[PDB]
Design a protein around this ligand. Structure first.
Ligand SMILES: *[C@@H]1O[C@H](CO)[C@@H](O[C@@H]2O[C@H](CO)[C@@H](O[C@@H]3O[C@H](CO[C@H]4O[C@H](CO)[C@@H](O)[C@H](O[C@H]5O[C@H](CO)[C@@H](O)[C@H](O)[C@@H]5O)[C@@H]4O)[C@@H](O)[C@H](O)[C@@H]3O)[C@H](O)[C@H]2NC(C)=O)[C@H](O)[C@H]1NC(C)=O
Ligand SMILES: *[C@@H]1O[C@H](CO)[C@@H](O[C@@H]2O[C@H](CO)[C@@H](O[C@@H]3O[C@H](CO)[C@@H](O)[C@H](O)[C@@H]3O)[C@H](O)[C@H]2NC(C)=O)[C@H](O)[C@H]1NC(C)=O
Ligand SMILES: *[C@@H]1O[C@H](CO)[C@@H](O[C@@H]2O[C@H](CO)[C@@H](O)[C@H](O)[C@H]2NC(C)=O)[C@H](O)[C@H]1NC(C)=O
Ligand SMILES: *[C@@H]1O[C@H](CO)[C@@H](O[C@@H]2O[C@H](CO)[C@@H](O)[C@H](O)[C@H]2NC(C)=O)[C@H](O)[C@H]1NC(C)=O
Ligand code: NAG
Ligand code: NAG
Ligand code: NAG
Ligand code: NAG
Lengths: 132, 535, 231, 224, 231, 231
């Protein structure tokens, strides 16, 4: 079957690849790459803040897709030190075109109550943001 | 894809069904929208039932949806089924436009006929049945036969005069009871799918009015579903009767055709599961509880358990099938699965468990392997330590936090193998660790100064453990070893040694004292040392 | 005018937007004057500020009894039992039990204005369709992107049970009038729905002139480094 | 219980397939039994049939009466006067007439279903927004493209005043759950509104797969 | 030769892979016998070892004195010193401390083998380009599917300053020869780099054949008009 | 200071630019300032030239002499046996020539930039991986398509012996910084390489943006009413 190389929910993109025997030469093997992009039509430039206008630009870099920010342990026959797998995983939140079901995105909205104001938070994803 | 369920279901006209569907363990999938839609010729999956409050008119009052967050599944009950309910169905979460779902090919049959008016027998395969065939009292002192009806001609298969069929020699036998019954009772100790068909029993050689037909149907046991997560464990409970208790069981996996054996009671084992499989003792009921750890994609498929003198899958014997689906979206943290230790040093393995079942019993054994799949407990919350150790082994039950640590000092090549993380808990988080040993490569980071410690009774004694900068920011501790664990000893620390002073001295202070470290909660490299007192 | 005790469910706006689930044990239907005593089981120290008796035009009295600081009980589902004694109505009990057997979260759908109101350029009508929710009581408000609108500027109809075969659900529709000037001028108008079964109790929906694929969409896509290195 | 005369105007169901209408009078707040007489002024061949009287939760009675055969008269703005006499309050009289001084016809606006329900493949909520009319009484009836749906099938709300200034213009709404299959097959689901202000006392609107199709959306794919 | 003092900061492998910061204080340039004294200011109990003296060209002695102050001490930014008193003359003093002014982390770039070698079946040259970092010393290691290869198979080059302007940075390009067969069997060959600026002090980049440059690519763009969830 | 003979090989620059030869016979570690004599095999035409001497750090001295020899004697492998003589030191004689027994041509390999830097649109890196050559000496240069690039704009790491088996194969790397703007216009940047075992004494390779781009760059757009997404 096909092998997966990156499946980033933030900016929905699925980059997979596979090795197929070259039809013109059984000795040679071709490396095919499949990509699946999901460009929405109702999201905004910022998905956490709804005041931003609709996003109709959708810039897609391949360096941002296969990022793997998560750290990984390394063994050099002595210590099991930790290490990162990217050089562009800096920390202001980056732009995420689409939502991630696992994550919970909320927004602050002021409301009135008996002549008083309160900062209540709302959930954009009904399925997500549950106390469990 | 991650959704698993019955790929094919077969019911009957005017009957109820209870379909179950699993899904990963997440707050979303538990609180999301469950749905049960039917797929037509246009591709659009027509929704019929949902957990939001929708119910199609066709299923009004007949079906009902329930979500079990504890089970982490959701069942779909249906009633008053018919033939029009046949078709391709789905079972997933959210919407049908996505992929989270599992196709279903429900083909509801109709009750065709009961032509033989007396006795139907539609049971499982490899089981035992009692074929009843009454007759007339006047025909008792005469013929007592049973033939097999076919589209070509009838064939005598069983008879009291030993005139039987080759395919039933030994697999069946006639039994004549007393008490003035006037009815035939025939046993069939071995059933097969080919044995199905129609049979005709009759008494008396002449034309008797008891030519009674019989409808025999041999079925297979409903494969029990097993929705397990990746890198987890599983418990295959094969509970049969006492008849096969003294026989040899087995456990195979169905491939593209036949079943590939994996393990049996004769010591055989597949190299793929070497270290992550065993067999539990056999109780008086002949129940088996095969255990497997480190689940992977290749483990998914149909598993089968049976019994035979050879302990191999032979057609015509009891069978217990399972269908295991491995969920790639597992919650178990990616463990190392291998621990490369060095002789003389020490090792600190972390055995996990569900933090809710912390008030349970935990154990730790060494996988023997070739003998018969054993697991002799070496240390636990209640079990002590044997004599082969007398140190170099202890438990450290972290108050909660999810996991507990195990220490193993004085390592040697004879300790390499496989070690499991057992516990009296239904969480089934048994992790398998492959312990690899290597020769003395370099010196240990922890070394005590007085090696042959010979203290004196009633006289202050001191012992200092080396403390390199490698663990400068880590915690340290001295603990006295016991057959149940290690008791911490409030010692003195130095900014680069770890001192330990015993102002008084009693003969009970002797034993194995340990010098270790701690990184907040976990442990690291440690060392042991025996302390004796003179007179 | 006969005796009749009833435990009034606390107001949703007094439960979500606030933190006082003031329960009321109303003893309505009394042809005779007042002079009763109220009692509760979960005595958490908060004394039941008993209220006066109102004499409706029909000619009968109705007493009330408040219980503040019972939010934890409602969230946990602890049943509330009220006992009232009176010469004409000695024995009288009322029971509260939060619905936690077949509750569903509301499904909000902020629809855009029609096609004719746009041509008029006078006033537009926005509708917020809230669907699927067993608890009848529901809260609905509107906001001008970030400024809450007064209740007198929009309308909120009464919930009604949804027909059809299945479970029990309700449905409401709130209307908001907007000027075409603010609509064309990129002003985000949102609908806020408050409910108990929702996660965090609230869900928001926004809309503007770009309701979503309004026949005029200028989309772009740039897949750079498609043949690069995917670590 | 203080007796009080309350006159009721015929409902919108008179202009329906029915024949005649019916004006009604009622006297609420009576402690004495029936026995009065509901006499009228425009009793031209119309039998002033009486009806049973009910009670309140405290003993206050409620007499009633009807006047059949006054459909054409009321339609022409004819005035009617009610007159009753009972001991507890002597004689009580009232007057009514069809209101047409400030009449405004409704403005139907059928909204399409939201794109969120399309992904569920279940039912679709079709809305029929009404607006602009003084008489809050309004008739609402859905149609499956020339088929009359039952009242329990669809849903209708109550009229409420608008949040504006200048005049009283109420509005109503109505939601209908249509099967997604029929909605995709191409079946018109019309909304019929009834009001005396409209010509023929009926207005109709239709909607199904008719809208600016989004076929003009421009997508620009660049694989630099 | 003329005597002189030189404070050598601890190495990197002895600091990141190891946590002892053996800071050295050498007294070179001496053409006379030894017999000096070394003293340190941060006397944390660890007695400073006065190593023996070696002999350089033209009979130029050289003394050294180390101090294992551990990585934590040298990491906190404490300023160390070395006061030495030699016999050939009066006395001398120096100072040394960690630097964190214009410190930048390296920008690792694991380049794949060139197509010139893929056409054959011999060895493939893997390059690990390290760029943008002020601290000169840098560690470079490789792993063949969780297995560190001996340094006798790598080809690390001394850092050299960039030719641009502005900040001061250095570059290195470690090379590793890999069998083409192993490159086709699907085995990984990652490159690890150790640096001070790096949070966690280690970065990794791993590349099998599929991450490299493919040939027949297939892109599939989708226009989802529903919710903005990726699933 | 120990007087010792030393023969310096001519830089490959002059040899691959139009110069016969220029071997330098030096006598380092000399003590006392006084002249010397240098004899050798008589080349074609030129005789001998005594260069100026200098001192060292601790006082050592060094006297040098150049021999503008012949390129034909180099290609053929002839030796320019030197012989130095002066008071206080003995008569030292050395011999050096061309290594014409095992010579390999450099296998140049020009790699493209990474996908990361190609996206930042700031500055890209180009590597000229050279390998396979017994004589570690080599001349490396860059070009801006046709113009001669300066060495102050790129780097040239020192050669190093490969970890191979058998022959003494070396390897070098040269990083060049290029602006992404030139890249967008489709410019070129080649890598000049000069070696002894190279016909024409030169070899280069260019970097036009394509450099064998992938074939069949497919693409598809999906905008149907039914998303039908897979998982
Ligand atoms: C997680 O999933 C499992 C598997 O579906 C759930 O187990 C069943 O869940 C259903 C629905 O909640 C329960 O239905 C109730 O059952 C009550 C009594 O329990 C009987 O259930 C079976 C109903 O046919 C019955 O066969 C069963 O007999 C078995 O146990 C007996 C001893 O208890 C034993 O003597 C028998 O030989 C046989 O082995 C139970 O007696 C009933 O009173 C209710 O009205 C309702 O029908 C089942 O009981 C559950 N157990 C089953 C089917 O064995 C489980 O509930 C899920 N988790 C949670 C938290 O619910
Ligand atoms: C169906 O019935 C058959 C018949 O009983 C079961 O198999 C039978 O098991 C008995 C076990 O008691 C066998 O008899 C015994 O054999 C032992 C030798 O192992 C002997 O020492 C005892 O004295 C006794 O005779 C019997 O041979 C055997 N028969 C056959 C045909 O296998 C079978 O297990 C039953 N199956 C089920 C699913 O119940
Ligand atoms: C998108 O909107 C979100 C939510 O407003 C922004 O996150 C907030 O940013 C503000 C201002 O910097 C902070 O005060 C809040 O604390 C943030 N809320 C969080 C992090 O939950 C976010 O900055 C916006 N995106 C961008 C790119 O600016
Ligand atoms: C035929 O099959 C029946 C059913 O298995 C047998 O009944 C068994 O009889 C023995 C001896 O009495 C009991 O110990 C078993 O418990 C019975 N079976 C069960 C399931 O309980 C019967 O013996 C078989 N043979 C004949 C001749 O009937
Ligand atoms: C929702 O309302 C309940 C009512 O008491 C309250 O307890 C809860 O805190 C509210 N939700 C959040 C996220 O605060
Ligand atoms: C990396 O090492 C330096 C020097 O010891 C230290 O200051 C820094 O905290 C380390 N980074 C970590 C621990 O993440
Ligand atoms: C793969 O690329 C080659 C190169 O031109 C082409 O001939 C062939 O048709 C392609 N095959 C597929 C399946 O894309
Ligand atoms: C792939 O490219 C080659 C180039 O010659 C062309 O012949 C072939 O038709 C292409 N195939 C596809 C599927 O694009």
């Amino acid at each position: 079957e096909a092998t997966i190389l990156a499946d980033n929910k933030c900016m929905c993109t699925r980059v997979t690849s596979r090795i197929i025997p070259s039809t013109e030469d059984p000795n040679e093997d071709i490396v095919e790459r499949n990509i699946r992009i999901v460009v929405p039509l109702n999201n905004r430039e910022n998905i956490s803040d709804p005041t931003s206008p609709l996003r109709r630009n959708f810039v897609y870099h391949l360096s941002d897709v296969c990022k793997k920010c998560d750290p990984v342990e390394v063994e050099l026959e002595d210590q099991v030190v930790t290490a990162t797998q990217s050089n562009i995983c800096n920390e202001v939140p980056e732009t995420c075109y689409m939502y991630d079901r696992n994550k919970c995105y909320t927004t602050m909205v002021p409301l009135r109550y008996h002549g008083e104001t309160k900062m209540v938070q709302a959930a954009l994803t009904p399925d997500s943001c549950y106390p469990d | 894809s991650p959704i698993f369920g019955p790929q094919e279901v077969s019911s009957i006209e005017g009957d109820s069904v209870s379909i179950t569907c699993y899904y990963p363990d997440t707050s979303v999938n538990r609180h999301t929208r469950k749905y049960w839609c039917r797929q037509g010729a246009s591709g659009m999956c027509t929704t019929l039932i949902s957990s939001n409050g929708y119910l199609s008119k066709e299923y009004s009052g007949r079906a009902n949806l329930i979500n079990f967050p504890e089970n982490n599944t959701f069942v779909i009950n249906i009633e008053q089924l018919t033939q029009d309910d046949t078709g391709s169905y789905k079972c997933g979460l959210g919407t049908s436009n996505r992929g989270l779902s599992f196709d279903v090919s429900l083909e509801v049959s109709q009750v065709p006929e009961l032509p033989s008016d007396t006795h139907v027998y539609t049971k499982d395969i490899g089981r035992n049945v009692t074929i009843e065939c009454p007759f007339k009292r006047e025909n008792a002192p005469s013929k007592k036969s049973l033939c097999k009806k076919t589209n070509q001609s009838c064939e005598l298969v069983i008879d009291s005069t030993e005139k039987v069929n080759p395919s039933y020699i030994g697999r069946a036998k006639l039994f004549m009871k007393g008490t003035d019954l006037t009815v035939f009772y025939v046993n069939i100790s071995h059933l097969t799918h080919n044995d199905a068909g129609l049979y005709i029993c009759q008494a008396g050689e002449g034309p008797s009015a008891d030519k009674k037909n019989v409808d025999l149907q041999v079925l297979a046991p409903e494969p029990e579903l097993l929705y397990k997560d990746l890198r987890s464990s599983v418990t295959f409970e094969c509970d049969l009767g006492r008849e096969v208790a003294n026989e040899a069981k087995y456990l195979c996996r169905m491939n593209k055709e036949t079943c590939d054996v994996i393990i049996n009671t004769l010591g055989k084992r597949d190299p793929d599961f070497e270290g992550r499989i065993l067999i539990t003792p056999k109780d008086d009921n002949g129940r088996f509880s095969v255990l497997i750890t480190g689940l992977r994609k290749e483990d998914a498929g149909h598993y089968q358990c049976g019994a035979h003198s050879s302990g191999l899958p032979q057609e015509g014997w009891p069978i217990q099938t399972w269908q295991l689906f491995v969920n790639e979206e597992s919650t178990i943290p990616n463990r190392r699965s291998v621990v490369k230790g060095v002789t003389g040093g020490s090792v600190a393995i972390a055995c996990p468990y569900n933090p809710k079942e912390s008030s349970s019993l935990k154990y730790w054994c060494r996988w023997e392997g070739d003998g018969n799949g054993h697991c002799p407990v070496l240390v636990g919350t209640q079990a002590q330590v044997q004599e082969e150790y007398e140190g170099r082994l202890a438990l450290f039950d972290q108050p909660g936090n999810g996991t507990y640590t195990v220490i193993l000092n004085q390592l040697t090549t004879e300790d390499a193998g496989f070690y499991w993380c057992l516990t009296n808990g239904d969480s089934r988080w048994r992790t398998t660790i492959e312990l690899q040993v290597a020769e003395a490569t370099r010196e240990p980071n922890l070394e005590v100064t007085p090696q042959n410690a010979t203290a004196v009774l009633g006289e202050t004694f001191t012992v200092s453990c080396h403390y390199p900068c490698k663990f400068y920011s880590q915690e340290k501790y001295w603990c006295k070893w016991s057959n149940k664990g290690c008791h911490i000893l409030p010692s003195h620390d130095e900014g680069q040694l770890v001192s330990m002073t015993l102002n008084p001295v009693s003969k009970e202070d002797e034993g194995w004292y340990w010098c270790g470290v701690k990184q907040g909660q976990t442990y690291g490299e440690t060392t042991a040392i025996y302390i004796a007192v003179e007179e | 005018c006969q005796p009749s005790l009833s435990l009034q469910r606390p107001a949703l706006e007094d439960l979500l937007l606030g933190s006082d689930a003031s329960i009321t044990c109303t003893l309505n239907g009394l042809r005779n004057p007042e002079g009763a005593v109220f009692t509760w089981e979960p005595s958490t120290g908060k004394d039941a500020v008993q209220k006066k008796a109102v004499q409706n035009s029909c000619g009968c009295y109705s007493v009330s009894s408040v219980l503040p600081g019972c939010a934890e009980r409602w969230n946990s589902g602890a049943s509330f039992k009220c006992t009232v004694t009176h010469p004409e109505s000695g024995t009288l009990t009322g029971t509260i039990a939060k619905v936690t057997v077949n509750t569903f979260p509301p499904q909000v759908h902020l629809l855009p204005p029609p096609s004719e109101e746009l041509a008029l350029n006078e006033l537009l009508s926005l509708t917020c369709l809230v669907r699927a929710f067993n608890p009848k009581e529901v809260l609905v408000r509107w906001l001008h992107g970030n400024e809450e609108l007064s209740p007198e500027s929009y309308l909120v109809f009464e919930p009604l049970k949804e027909p059809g075969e299945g479970a029990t659900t309700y449905l409401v529709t709130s209307v908001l009038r907007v000027s075409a000037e603010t609509w064309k001028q990129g002003d985000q108008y949102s609908c806020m729905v408050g409910h108990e079964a929702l996660p965090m109790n609230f869900t928001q929906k926004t809309i503007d002139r770009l309701s979503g694929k309004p026949t005029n969409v200028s989309v772009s896509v740039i897949m750079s480094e498609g043949d690069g290195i995917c670590y």
